[PDB]
Amino acid sequence: MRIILLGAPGAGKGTQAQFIMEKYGIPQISTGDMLRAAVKSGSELGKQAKDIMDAGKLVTDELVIALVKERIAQEDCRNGFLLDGFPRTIPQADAMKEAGINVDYVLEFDVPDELIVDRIVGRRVHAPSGRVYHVKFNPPKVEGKDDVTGEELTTRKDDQEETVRKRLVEYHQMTAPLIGYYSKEAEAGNTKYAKVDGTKPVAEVRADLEKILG
Ligand SMILES: Nc1nc2c(ncn2[C@@H]2O[C@H](COP(=O)(O)OP(=O)(O)CP(=O)(O)O)[C@@H](O)[C@H]2O)c(=O)[nH]1
């Protein structure tokens, strides 16, 4: 089973990764994990990636696709793989096709923007220890305090509402054509495509996934 899982930043698609991995006996793979592992390994692609990253440059789509192709040839992908959060653009999807990398399902994990903003802006952290909380959905023991140390909890600057909203605007503009691309691929019989309501309780999402995936 070969699955691409797509979702907006903050939607929390990763909440279903372990369910999928355990269902099919497949690893969760990502461009970030692939790059880190390649650089650490000193492989040929890893050396190219390290030189680019060490200069503060972005790896090319061609190198990213080559890393995907290499990753899925590894023995742990014999049963398939869960490719998390990539492709991100039509050019990247077409490069997957040109390279010969088809998947069985593309799953779009949807959460409304306003709920994403709620899910994120309510987060609070204790930076010294990296413990995190949420005001409405997972309140702390003592209002505004880490129930351990009692130091004033903070909010991460990346989690500021205006930064969150800007990220979502950019994501939808980038992703709309890609969703349409995969719906077309499904119409052509090359893959299957389904949207998932990620706002539901996790067991409800899981049941919806089971109906999609058979
Ligand atoms: N912080 C940050 N994240 C970004 C940016 N652009 C895209 N992202 C993506 O947004 C996500 C932010 O993480 P988080 O707020 O935990 O979102 P999430 O949906 O719960 C994480 P997951 O997709 O694994 O379930 C990351 O997956 C990150 O790769 C950016 O400019 N800043």
Ligand SMILES: [Mg+2]
């Ligand atoms: Mg994830």
